[PDB]
Amino acid sequence: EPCVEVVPNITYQCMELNFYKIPDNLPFSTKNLDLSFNPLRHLGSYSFFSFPELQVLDLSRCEIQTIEDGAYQSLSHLSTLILTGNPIQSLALGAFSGLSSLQKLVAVETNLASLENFPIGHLKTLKELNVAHNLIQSFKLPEYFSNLTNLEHLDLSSNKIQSIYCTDLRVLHQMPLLNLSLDLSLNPMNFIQPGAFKEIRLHKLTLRNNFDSLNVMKTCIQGLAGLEVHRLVLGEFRNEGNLEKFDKSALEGLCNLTIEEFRLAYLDYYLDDIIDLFNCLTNVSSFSLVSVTIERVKDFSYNFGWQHLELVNCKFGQFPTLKLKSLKRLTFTSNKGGNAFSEVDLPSLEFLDLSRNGLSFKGCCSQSDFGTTSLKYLDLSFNGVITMSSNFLGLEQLEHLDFQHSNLKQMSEFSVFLSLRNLIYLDISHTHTRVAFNGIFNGLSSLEVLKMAGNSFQENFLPDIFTELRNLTFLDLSQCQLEQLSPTAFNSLSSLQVLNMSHNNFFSLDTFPYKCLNSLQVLDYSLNHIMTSKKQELQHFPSSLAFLNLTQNDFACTCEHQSFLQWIKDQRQLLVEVERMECATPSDKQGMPVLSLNITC
Amino acid sequence: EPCVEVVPNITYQCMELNFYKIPDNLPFSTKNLDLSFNPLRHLGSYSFFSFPELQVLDLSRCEIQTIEDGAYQSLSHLSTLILTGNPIQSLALGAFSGLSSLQKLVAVETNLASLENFPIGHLKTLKELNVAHNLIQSFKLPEYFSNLTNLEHLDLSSNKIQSIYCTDLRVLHQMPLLNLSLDLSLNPMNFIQPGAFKEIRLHKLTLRNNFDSLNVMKTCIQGLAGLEVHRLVLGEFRNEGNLEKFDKSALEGLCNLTIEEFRLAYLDYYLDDIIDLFNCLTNVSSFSLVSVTIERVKDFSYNFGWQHLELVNCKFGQFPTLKLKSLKRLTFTSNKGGNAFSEVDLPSLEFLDLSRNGLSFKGCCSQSDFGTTSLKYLDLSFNGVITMSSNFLGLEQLEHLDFQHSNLKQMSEFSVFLSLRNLIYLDISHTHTRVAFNGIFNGLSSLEVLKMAGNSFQENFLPDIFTELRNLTFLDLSQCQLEQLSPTAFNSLSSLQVLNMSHNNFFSLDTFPYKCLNSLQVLDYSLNHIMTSKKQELQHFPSSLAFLNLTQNDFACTCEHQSFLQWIKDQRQLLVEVERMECATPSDKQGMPVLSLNITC
Amino acid sequence: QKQYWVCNSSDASISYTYCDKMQYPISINVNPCIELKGSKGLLHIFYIPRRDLKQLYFNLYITVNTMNLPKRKEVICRGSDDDYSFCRALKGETVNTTISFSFKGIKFSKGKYKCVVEAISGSPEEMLFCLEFVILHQPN
Amino acid sequence: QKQYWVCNSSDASISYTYCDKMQYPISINVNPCIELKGSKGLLHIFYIPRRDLKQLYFNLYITVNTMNLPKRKEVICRGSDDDYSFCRALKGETVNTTISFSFKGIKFSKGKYKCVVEAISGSPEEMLFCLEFVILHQPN
Numbered sequence A, B: 001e002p003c004v005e006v007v008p009n010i011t012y013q014c015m016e017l018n019f020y021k022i023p024d025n026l027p028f029s030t031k032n033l034d035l036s037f038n039p040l041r042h043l044g045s046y047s048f049f050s051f052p053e054l055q056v057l058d059l060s061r062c063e064i065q066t067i068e069d070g071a072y073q074s075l076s077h078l079s080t081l082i083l084t085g086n087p088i089q090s091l092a093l094g095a096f097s098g099l100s101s102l103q104k105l106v107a108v109e110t111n112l113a114s115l116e117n118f119p120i121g122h123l124k125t126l127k128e129l130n131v132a133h134n135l136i137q138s139f140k141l142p143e144y145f146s147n148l149t150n151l152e153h154l155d156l157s158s159n160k161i162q163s164i165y166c167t168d169l170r171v172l173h174q175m176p177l178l179n180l181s182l183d184l185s186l187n188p189m190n191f192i193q194p195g196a197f198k199e200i201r202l203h204k205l206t207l208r209n210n211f212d213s214l215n216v217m218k219t220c221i222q223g224l225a226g227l228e229v230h231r232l233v234l235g236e237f238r239n240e241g242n243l244e245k246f247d248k249s250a251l252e253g254l255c256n257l258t259i260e261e262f263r264l265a266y267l268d269y270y271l272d273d274i275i276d277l278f279n280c281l282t283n284v285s286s287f288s289l290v291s292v293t294i295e296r297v298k299d300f301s302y303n304f305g306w307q308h309l310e311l312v313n314c315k316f317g318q319f320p321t322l323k324l325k326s327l328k329r330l331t332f333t334s335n336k337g338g339n340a341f342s343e344v345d346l347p348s349l350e351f352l353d354l355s356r357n358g359l360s361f362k363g364c365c366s367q368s369d370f371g372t373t374s375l376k377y378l379d380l381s382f383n384g385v386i387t388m389s390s391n392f393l394g395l396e397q398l399e400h401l402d403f404q405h406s407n408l409k410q411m412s413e414f415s416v417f418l419s420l421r422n423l424i425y426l427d428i429s430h431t432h433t434r435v436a437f438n439g440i441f442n443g444l445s446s447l448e449v450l451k452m453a454g455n456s457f458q459e460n461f462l463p464d465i466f467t468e469l470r471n472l473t474f475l476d477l478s479q480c481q482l483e484q485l486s487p488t489a490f491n492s493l494s495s496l497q498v499l500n501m502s503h504n505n506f507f508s509l510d511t512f513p514y515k516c517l518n519s520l521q522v523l524d525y526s527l528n529h530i531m532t533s534k535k536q537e538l539q540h541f542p543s544s545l546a547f548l549n550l551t552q553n554d555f556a557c558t559c560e561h562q563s564f565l566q567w568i569k570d571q572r573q574l575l576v577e578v579e580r581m582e583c584a585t586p587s588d589k590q591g592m593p594v595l596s597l598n599i600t601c
Numbered sequence C, D: 001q002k003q004y005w006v007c008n009s010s011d012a013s014i015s016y017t018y019c020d021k022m023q024y025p026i027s028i029n030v031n032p033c034i035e036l037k038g039s040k041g042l043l044h045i046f047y048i049p050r051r052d053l054k055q056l057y058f059n060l061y062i063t064v065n066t067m068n069l070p071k072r073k074e075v076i077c078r079g080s081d082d083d084y085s086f087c088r089a090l091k092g093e094t095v096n097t098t099i100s101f102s103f104k105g106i107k108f109s110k111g112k113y114k115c116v117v118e119a120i121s122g123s124p125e126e127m128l129f130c131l132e133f134v135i136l137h138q139p140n
């Protein structure tokens, strides 16, 4: 029964180690004692006495039948208790007595029955109270919540709460300050008599998969009246039975609340129209849908005040036609349905993300496409096929631009990035690109990070295309099948520090192309096959070089060009991994580190 | 003034050589004398006397004012005359007198006035008669056409023929046999009085860009009645002014003819519906549209008897929804508009070509997509992005399959060609493919031509994927960046004769991988960098090898592995181009053929 | 290694065993059994995790009759607002869930098909278990 | 080599000369002149070919300020039923045609722009002429 020492005399974990008592033969100053799945059928007063210091304590599935009085007494600084899965049939009054600084309290799968006979009355600093998967029958908040401030979460999901009445929540009418991110989900409820929620405030309210029909949902939405929830979350769960009807006059009566952030989070019904539905869900400054299939619908053109939208994992049949006078951010990511694109009109939009959809652009990118003129961010990566018919025109203010793993067409036929004078980032990695025009990267004067790994080169000869890109500090070039490089290629590049050049097919190293790089610190030549040089005129690299990875390529262990291996014992100060720099060419000299074999000839 | 001798004492051409008389100081047995742009302001009798034999004669832009009587007399076997651009103001009666075997007769841009005073009455064997761009005022066929049989073409386009009457074409009611592929295009005509064309027969009729409005066209179509043309061609030309209206009741009245092959060949009007238009163009066994923009239209679902369709260079906004119970061939090639695809239903279709459209397939290829089950041919090459969610299922009868320059996705995740047991051809060249599954080519047992040039390989090591492909006679592998090959890779391949392996990155040649290839005749290793071998155990190639291209790669000219260069002077019987097989490694030995430098060490 | 059967069909013989050191039990059922031809059905799962079923995902190592495939990575639940309710579980909490599935449109062939299943979840992303699935196949 | 002017605009100075041995005349006009910014207009051509204007196409060798581009290949007329009427001409036949054009949506920069124009047509596909276009550019 060795308790594993996770962090040396700080944290020990004793899980599934068949215990029956606390391991008090453990170091005296402990923190974060894990103790779960060890059978402890009952606890006693001052159980945790040899642990005067303790931050986190876990008792999960320790099958605690009863917690006796005065337990946990000699135990402060205890910030967390996790009493998950312990079936408690006798929680003695005054339990949890001495706990000076307790914030988190997780009692899940504990056989609770109500919250009025729940011993946390004396508690303070208590922020979370996760009472989920319990047996609680009515949502009547007990009175000791008056003394209990600082409570921020109260997650009672999966409970058997059936309905609500008026003077339920008579508490909360006495709270000048109260943040209660309440979450009531999966509660089968069929009645909310009016006026119950009134002059009340919340900071979240989550009701998903609880109403069995459209009429129940309708009149219970009628039950909540004047709620003022700062963020509402409705929907259902893919996991169980669901609604079999959803159209216009459902979601009605939702029009008396004061919402600011909405989220419908699932719908098994192929909804087919979006206005006169979600009708009184305007003025919500954050709209969001997730996993809801609205396949065939034409009229998306409508005016809403929606300062943030998000359509994640939704299916369609067409690209929706958005017309939003006020929408600053959009996230049309990982959708599956309609692989095309048509011009949307978002006059005030500053962020945009259309990633991993798979859609295709024929009108490419111009101010004519998105209707805006101040778009700071744009991600069209992991899409299908992007045809360049217009260099980014009217988008002169665009600092981020990703394209990686898309399919760029006609990228060599003109200067495609000719308008982007304020651009810091550019990732055209692994697009099916054949660089055959010396003016491809023309216009990018502020580009500092250039990633392109997996793009061919005309006849596999690196031309002088990195000119006027003088801020480039990071340059990625790997799997570009380069067999030669212009001797004057990386000039005007005085700020380049990282320079990736590995996984090409070279056979000669030299230092003239890198004679003048004042800021280079790393230079990677790894998965090449580099055997010899021009001639031993190979000179010292610039002083700044602090790293020269030369690992993983073949070598030639015979008398001639032993001067080359002498010039790679030139530097021991700049090599990296002398372990995988070895011999390849003879059979007798195999796997041998090069600086290691001392031969005269 | 040297007449160029094109084919030695057979054909001489004297073009733009400023002549004034026939060059009779030319060999005596001539054929195909070109003589054009030489000024010959007049001809005389027996002009071409020193050419007793002559097949083809050209007089284009020779500015012949008058052709005197009896000219061309001592001139038979003359199959062709090209009197193009010669302004003839006095063509004497009885000209073209002695011409025993004349078939073609091109008189274009000649200032003709009518066909009744046209000296070809005595002619026979005359097949073509191209009288285009002339000045002819009425389409009244003269009577000597009775004697004139064998006439197959009569192309009088761009003429000033204004209208037609009944007893025009009183001839052609006396012709038991008459093939007349007539073509009347660009003739400004505004009246066809009824009954004119009647009991008449043609073999083509081409009227494009001749009616100035919809009413003119309508009632002139009403003019032609009971024509029985075997192939009709209407439309217009992008080059000039065009119709400004085209909808349902245009093209009406076309319903009295007996058409079998139709072609509308251009339309500047964005037509927006296809039935109740082209309404009485059913039962035509060959439909065809070219360059006509029908962008927004939903109802393509309609029944026609159309045994061949073709939609070349058409624009749309959607993929048309074809529903044709009888359509054997389709050619949806080079369209531009709608880059998608939806399931069509062509129950009896045996050919299919969707090439260079650029559209994208999400449902890929299955019997569920094209509704047929006997499709012998399929070309989806040069398209956008093709996602494999189904190996060709229900298409077990498919002998041709092209994919080249498309974008295949998920091609390694399962045996994608698993149903195609009858497949001879396969071109997956230059798709963005990374071969990382030894079962990619599983199922292709009859494949004899396998093209794949430009497809990566996992770690650049050729695995044993060419198994069960025993009929493969042609194997393409170039630009596959292969650095190693399994020593047992091309086994079970006894029928391979051509074997392309160039433009990879090798550094060692050997003969063991090709120890057993009985049918190999060509073996290409060109754009590699091959310097040495395993060891001089390199053995004789199989007898069948008749060609070993080793050109264009680097070599190492020092004493050691002079035994390798000795083994490449092993064979002079199988080398190919000893001119570009040279030296690379030393500076003093540069550009030197290898078998050439005799050194001891 | 003890063999765990699941279900037979006309052309399937699913089973599985364990990879790793820990062998925490699990209960998987499928009704009706998968016909490796295009099938439909339900998948009933009874589990008690030793970690949080949060940011759960699968690494699949598939083997088509002694021929490896590439590696598959399937994200079941991401972060906020999962499609599923069971990915809100904690340690020691009973998961008792049901998920329906269907597929069609692919032909397979005979042979020992294998798939190594690696579940990963939690705060530092440590594994939850490994399982090894054996799926024979012989179409009718 | 004699210089052949075409038209000036606000940001264009088109001109051209001849490549090859034969120098058969041709007449090209454009109205109004191309603004290398997105333009519209008509193109009037008067020609008398020395071959057939059949299966005509262009090879374009473009040069962006001493930087070559790839080679362009433009098929004007293919075979049957051309969009244009002038591609039914024969040798010696007057071609007198008019074609309208328009483009927009691309930014260029300053510099000597060049384009070598090679027309090919006919039965054995021999060249019809070469021309060399010089297009200066200086936006306003």
Ligand SMILES: *[C@@H]1O[C@H](CO)[C@@H](O[C@@H]2O[C@H](CO)[C@@H](O[C@@H]3O[C@H](CO)[C@@H](O)[C@H](O)[C@H]3NC(C)=O)[C@H](O)[C@H]2NC(C)=O)[C@H](O)[C@H]1NC(C)=O
Pocket (backbone or CB within 6 Å): A522, A523, A524, A526, A547, A548, A549, A551, A576
């Ligand atoms: C010898 O070759 C090695 C590869 O073969 C180079 O490797 C290192 O690769 C690591 C990739 O995992 C880089 O790490 C990453 O570090 C960056 C730092 O900013 C983080 O952002 C990334 O998230 C992180 N990625 C992961 C998966 O951890 C290492 O940074 C990088 N080494 C260096 C020095 O940058 C070696 O670089 C090369 N030898 C030398 C001296 O460069």
Ligand SMILES: *[C@@H]1O[C@H](CO)[C@@H](O[C@@H]2O[C@H](CO)[C@@H](O[C@@H]3O[C@H](CO)[C@@H](O)[C@H](O)[C@H]3NC(C)=O)[C@H](O)[C@H]2NC(C)=O)[C@H](O)[C@H]1NC(C)=O
Pocket (backbone or CB within 6 Å): B522, B523, B524, B526, B547, B548, B549, B551, B576
């Ligand atoms: C040495 O390398 C040469 C290339 O570097 C190989 O070249 C030859 O390439 C030609 C491509 O133009 C092939 O020609 C074509 O021939 C086939 C015959 O069936 C025709 O279909 C194609 O239309 C035609 N294409 C063109 C553009 O003409 C030659 O066939 C081919 N040579 C041989 C023998 O096939 C040499 O092959 C290689 N040396 C040897 C001995 O193979």
Ligand SMILES: *[C@@H]1O[C@H](CO)[C@@H](O[C@@H]2O[C@H](CO)[C@@H](O[C@@H]3O[C@H](CO)[C@@H](O)[C@H](O)[C@@H]3O)[C@H](O)[C@H]2NC(C)=O)[C@H](O)[C@H]1NC(C)=O
Pocket (backbone or CB within 6 Å): A453, A478, A500, A501, A502, A522, A524
């Ligand atoms: C230059 O660019 C290459 C492009 O790949 C960078 O390569 C990556 O290098 C890392 C570090 O070795 C590789 O990670 C290795 O991954 C294996 C498997 O995951 C792991 O077992 C190793 O311990 C190591 O972490 C990685 O595979 C490799 N490729 C990719 C696509 O990431 C390289 O790091 C760059 N050089 C510099 C100096 O930044």
Ligand SMILES: *[C@@H]1O[C@H](CO)[C@@H](O[C@@H]2O[C@H](CO)[C@@H](O[C@@H]3O[C@H](CO)[C@@H](O)[C@H](O)[C@@H]3O)[C@H](O)[C@H]2NC(C)=O)[C@H](O)[C@H]1NC(C)=O
Pocket (backbone or CB within 6 Å): B453, B478, B500, B501, B502, B522, B524
């Ligand atoms: C093996 O496959 C390669 C793949 O390219 C074949 O290469 C092609 O070979 C021909 C013949 O040399 C090349 O044509 C050359 O073209 C230039 C320019 O057009 C011309 O000037 C030369 O005279 C010659 O014709 C061609 O460029 C080259 N590549 C392609 C894409 O066609 C090779 O022929 C194949 N080997 C065998 C034996 O078939």
Ligand SMILES: *[C@@H]1O[C@H](CO)[C@@H](O[C@@H]2O[C@H](CO)[C@@H](O)[C@H](O)[C@H]2NC(C)=O)[C@H](O)[C@H]1NC(C)=O
Pocket (backbone or CB within 6 Å): C008, C012, C013, C136
């Ligand atoms: C379920 O399928 C398995 C495998 O197909 C069956 O197991 C085989 O059982 C037959 C019948 O007894 C034996 O002949 C084979 O030798 C067994 N092979 C293996 C690998 O186990 C199993 O019997 C099937 N179950 C039922 C109820 O039919």
Ligand SMILES: *[C@@H]1O[C@H](CO)[C@@H](O[C@@H]2O[C@H](CO)[C@@H](O)[C@H](O)[C@H]2NC(C)=O)[C@H](O)[C@H]1NC(C)=O
Pocket (backbone or CB within 6 Å): D008, D012, D013, D136
């Ligand atoms: C048309 O444009 C050309 C080139 O832009 C003009 O030619 C230039 O003319 C100016 C004005 O006389 C001279 O200063 C330059 O030296 C000339 N340069 C070249 C290269 O020719 C021409 O003048 C313009 N035509 C008109 C009518 O303004």
Ligand SMILES: *[C@@H]1O[C@H](CO)[C@@H](O)[C@H](O)[C@H]1NC(C)=O
Pocket (backbone or CB within 6 Å): A152, A178, A179, A203
């Ligand atoms: C709870 O509400 C208070 C109101 O001041 C806010 O500061 C706090 O951030 C909220 N809680 C959380 C977890 O955001």
Ligand SMILES: *[C@@H]1O[C@H](CO)[C@@H](O)[C@H](O)[C@H]1NC(C)=O
Pocket (backbone or CB within 6 Å): A445, A446, A471
């Ligand atoms: C980046 O480029 C801009 C414009 O060329 C220049 O003003 C700036 O100094 C450069 N460096 C940095 C660190 O911004």
Ligand SMILES: *[C@@H]1O[C@H](CO)[C@@H](O)[C@H](O)[C@H]1NC(C)=O
Pocket (backbone or CB within 6 Å): B152, B178, B179, B203
């Ligand atoms: C003309 O008609 C006859 C009818 O027998 C046919 O044989 C011939 O092929 C036709 N002409 C052409 C050029 O096809």
Ligand SMILES: *[C@@H]1O[C@H](CO)[C@@H](O)[C@H](O)[C@H]1NC(C)=O
Pocket (backbone or CB within 6 Å): B445, B446, B471
């Ligand atoms: C091609 O393969 C088929 C089936 O494997 C076989 O019957 C045939 O003999 C092979 N060879 C030829 C030339 O068809």
Ligand SMILES: *[C@@H]1O[C@H](CO)[C@@H](O)[C@H](O)[C@H]1NC(C)=O
Pocket (backbone or CB within 6 Å): C046, C096
């Ligand atoms: C899971 O829940 C269902 C719901 O009725 C129940 O019937 C079943 O017994 C539960 N599973 C277990 C193992 O208890």
Ligand SMILES: *[C@@H]1O[C@H](CO)[C@@H](O)[C@H](O)[C@H]1NC(C)=O
Pocket (backbone or CB within 6 Å): D046, D096
């Ligand atoms: C071309 O045709 C038009 C048509 O009116 C005519 O005006 C013009 O003069 C013609 N061109 C020549 C060079 O004759």
